[PDB]
Amino acid sequence: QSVLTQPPSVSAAPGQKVTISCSGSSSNIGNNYVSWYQQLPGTAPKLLIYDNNKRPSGIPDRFSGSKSGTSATLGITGLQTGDEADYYCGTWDSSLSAWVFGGGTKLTVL
Amino acid sequence: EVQLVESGGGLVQPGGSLRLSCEASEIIVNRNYMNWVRQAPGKGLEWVSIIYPGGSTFYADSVKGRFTISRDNSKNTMYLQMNSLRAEDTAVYYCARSYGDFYVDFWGQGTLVTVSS
Amino acid sequence: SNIIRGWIFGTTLDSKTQSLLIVNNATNVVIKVCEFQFCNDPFLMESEFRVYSSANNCTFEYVSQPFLREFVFKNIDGYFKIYSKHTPINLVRDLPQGFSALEPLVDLPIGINITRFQTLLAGAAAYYVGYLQPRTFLLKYNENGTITDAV
Amino acid sequence: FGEVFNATRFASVYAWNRKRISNCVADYSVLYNSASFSTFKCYGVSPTKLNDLCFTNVYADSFVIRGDEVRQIAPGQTGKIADYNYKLPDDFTGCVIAWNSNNLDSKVGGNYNYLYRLFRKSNLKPFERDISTEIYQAGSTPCNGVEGFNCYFPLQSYGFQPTNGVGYQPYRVVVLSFELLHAPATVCGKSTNLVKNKCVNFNFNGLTGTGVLTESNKKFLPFQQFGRDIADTTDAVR
Ligand SMILES: *[C@@H]1O[C@H](CO)[C@@H](O)[C@H](O)[C@H]1NC(C)=O
C-alpha cells in the first residue's frame, strides 16, 4: 500500500503560522481530494479540513489548507496551547482502492 | 445528536475469531457509507474496510481474508469479524461515517483489540 | 370512392400488442408499427388525423411511393406480403368477367400475428372482402411470362 | 455509428442516453481500425465474427466517467459508478469503447452537467437508470424541501481542469449492446464478372449454377429474378 510521506514533527512558538505538507502521487493525491484529521492524545480524530481549501462547520478559524498538486499543505496562523496535537492526511488511492493515511506530524506549541 | 458506541475488543490468541459492534443515533447505518479504521499504539491510522450503501465491500490487502464484515439493518449495527488474528492486529478500532470517498466524519472512541500470549 | 385513404390492421388495438397502420396522403405512403389505443369509430374538406390517440414505441419506420383495384394481404413467418393490380372496367354491378394477375409490391418484416384486423378508413364504402384458403391451381404462362389463365 | 460514436457529449453517467440502431448495414471495421479510441474491450464477440454475426437490435448507451472508473463499466465490477450509476451484468456480448473528453472539456474549469450518484439506497438493475433528486436524508428525521445537516445531495459534479488530471480526467464511455429477438436480423455486411471467358463456379445471390455464362436476350419481367426453362433447372439468371 503506497503511504503519503508526512513531516515527522513541526514545532513553532505561539503567534507563528505553521505549515504541514503531505507528500503524494497522481495515483492517490493527484487525482483525489485530501483531508486533514486532528487527534488529541486519548481521543478519536476529528476532521480538521473539509475538502482541499474548504473548512468544516464546527472548526476553529486560523486553520486553512492548500492542495499543491501531488503534495498538500496545512497552514495555521498562531500556535495556541490547544493547537499542539497530531495531524493526519488522507485520500482514496484509485488503483489499490484503499484510503491512504500518512503517519502523522506531532505539532508542538512552544 | 449523532453518537457512536463500540465494544468487543479483548485479549485473544492468534487465529482466533472475535467480533465488534458499532451503535449510532440520527444516522441510518445502511443509508450512510460506513468505515472501520485502526490505530496501533502510538502509530499512524490504517484503513481496514468500507461498506457502500447498496452493499459493496472493499478491504485492504494487509487485512484481506483475515478480516470480514456485515451491516445489519434490523439491529442498526455494523459488525467487524476478524479471524487469523496476527501480531499487527493489536490497535483501537474506530467505526467512522464517510461522505462517500470525499472525507470521514463522526469518528468513534473505539475498543482496543489485543492479541498476545 | 377515392375518399378511401388506407386501413389499420390493429390485432387487438391495444397498448399491449403492436398495430400496423397504412395511410395515403396523395404524396407518399406511411407505415407505422406504433401501438394505437382502441378507437370506437375513427374518421378521416373532412378533418384529418383524429384516429391518432397516442403513438408511443415505434419499432419499424417506412415511407414509399403512394399506392394511388385488387389487393391481397397475407402474413407468413413474420413477413407481410401485399399484391396489387389496377385495371379499368365499367358497366359492371359486381366482379367484372376476365382474368387479371396480381403482382407483388413489398415484403415487410413485422414479425407479429394479426388475428382480428380492423377495416379501412374513408359516399358508399363499396369494399369487398374475401377469404383465402388452401388449394391447388394449374397456372399457364405465355411466351413472355404473363399468367394468362388457370384452373 | 457517428450519431453516438462522435457528437458533443453533455451526457452524464447518472442519466445515460440510449439509441436503437436497426434497419441499417453495420460495418464495425471502421470502429475497430479507427485507433482513435483509448479502449475497445469486447467480451463474448470475436472481431472477425462481429461483422459476420447478425442481430435483431443494436442498443448504444452514451455517458461520461473519469479515466479511473472506465474499468467499472464491465461485467462483475463493484464501485460507485457501476452499482449506483450504470451497470453491465455481461453487456450481452457487447463492446465498451472509451474516448478521452479532456479536449471536449474546454476552459480553465468547467464541471458542465456531469454528476455521480454517490447516494442511492440499493444497487441498480442491468441496463437501468435513476434520475430522482429525492434528498437521501440518511437519518430518522424525514428530509423534505428544507435542507438538513444530514439531507446532503445525491448528485455531485466532477471538476475537469485541462492541466494534470488523467485519472480525474474523463474518457467518454460508449457501450454497444446487440440482442437477438425472434424478429428477423438484417444487421450484417463482390468480385469482377467475366462472361464466357471460361466455365466458372459461382454464387450470385443464393444460387450455385457452376456453369459457363453467356449473353442472353430472353424477355424478362422486372420483378422477376431468375428463370427455370424445364424440370426446375435454372437456365438464366439476372
Ligand atoms: C411477347 O413479347 C413480344 C416482344 O416483341 C411481343 O411482340 C408480343 O406481343 C408479346 N406477347 C404478348 C401476348 O403480349
- Which one-letter DSSP state was computed for residue B101? T
Residues in chain A whose beta carbon is closer than 8 A to a beta carbon of chain D? Answer: 26-27, 30-32, 69, 94
Resolution in Å, one decimal, please.
Answer: 3.6
What are the distances in angstroms from CA D58 to CA C46, C60, D24, D92, D180?
42, 14, 10, 11, 9
Q: Which residues of C touch D (CB under 8 A)?
A: 59-61, 78, 103-104, 109, 111, 143-146
Distance of CA B84 to the CA centre of its chain: 16
Q: Strand, helix or coil at D106?
A: coil
Cα D218 to the chain's mean position, in Å? 48
The secondary structure of residue B15, as a DSSP letter, is T
Closest listed residue to residue D138, CA positions, set D126, D130, D150 = D150
Which residue from C58, D168, B5, D220 is spatially nearest to A94, judged by alpha carbons? D168
Which one, of B109, B112, B115, B19, lies nearest residue B72 by Cα?
B19
Determine the Cα–Cα distance for residues A46 and C147; give it in Å rounded to an integer.
94
Amino acid at the residue A45: P
Residue D33, H or E segment? helix D29-33
Q: Are D164 and A30 a contacting pair, CB within 8 Å? A: yes
CA angle B31, B36, A71 (to 5 degrees): 100
D161 vs D112: CA distance, rounded Å? 11
The span from the CA of A66 to the CA of A79, in Å, is 18
The residues, ordered by sequence, that sit 6+ positions from A40 with a Cβ below 8 Å of its Cβ are: A85, A86
Pairing of strands A9-12, A105-109: parallel
CB A20 within 8 A of CB A11: no
CA C13 – CA A49 distance, rounded (Å): 64
Q: Does A99 touch chain B (CB under 8 A)?
A: yes
Residue with cell 399468367: C147
Partners of residue A30 in chain D, C-beta under 8 Å: 164, 166-167
Å from CA of C147 to ligand 1 middle: 13
Do the beta carbons of residue D12 and residue D63 sit within 8 Å?
Answer: yes
Alpha helices in D45-181 (DSSP H): 47-52, 80
Diameter of chain B measured on Cα atoms: 40
Host H or E run for residue A93: strand A85-93
| Inter-chain touch D182–C103, beta carbons under 8 Å | no
Protein residues whose CB sits closer than 6 Å to any atom of ligand 1: C 142-144; D 219
Report CA(D220)–ligand 1 centroid distance (Å). 11
Q: Are residues B1 and B104 in contact, defined by beta-carbon separation less than 8 angstroms?
A: no
Mutate-to-test residue for ligand 1 from C99, C140, C142, C144, highest number of ligand atoms within 8 A of CB: C144
Q: In the numeric block, which cell numbers belong to residue C119?
A: 377495416
Residue D88: how many CA atoms within 13 Å on its side-chain side? 26
The method recorded for this entry reads cryo-EM
**A54 vs B99: CA distance, rounded Å:** 15
Using alpha carbons, select from B4, B33, B18, B15 the residue that is nearest to residue B80.
Answer: B18
DSSP secondary-structure letter at C78? Answer: T
Q: Looking at residue C54, what DSSP letter applies?
A: -
The CATH architecture annotation of domain A9-109 reads: Sandwich (2.60)
Q: Which of B37, B29, B33 is nearest to B62 (CA)?
A: B37
The residues spanned by each domain of chain B are 3-115
Q: Of all protein residues, whose CA lies closest to atom 9 belonging to ligand 1? A: C144
Which of ligand 1's atoms lies nearest the C-alpha of C144?
Answer: 1
- Atom of ligand 1 minimally distant from the CA of C143: 1
Strands B77-82 and D115-117: unpaired
| DSSP code at position D51 | H
Question: What is the assigned CATH class of domain B3-115?
Answer: mainly beta
Sign of the alpha-carbon torsion through D7, D8, D9, D15: negative
Residues of B with CB below 8 A from A104's CB?
44-45
Q: Which of C15, C12, C17, C6 is nearest to C42 (CA)?
A: C6
CA-CA distance, D83 to D96, in Å (whole number)? 17
| Ligand 1 centroid to residue D231 C-alpha, Å | 24
CA–CA gap between residue D130 and residue D119 (Å, rounded): 11
Q: What are the helix and strand counts (H, E) for chain A?
A: 0, 9
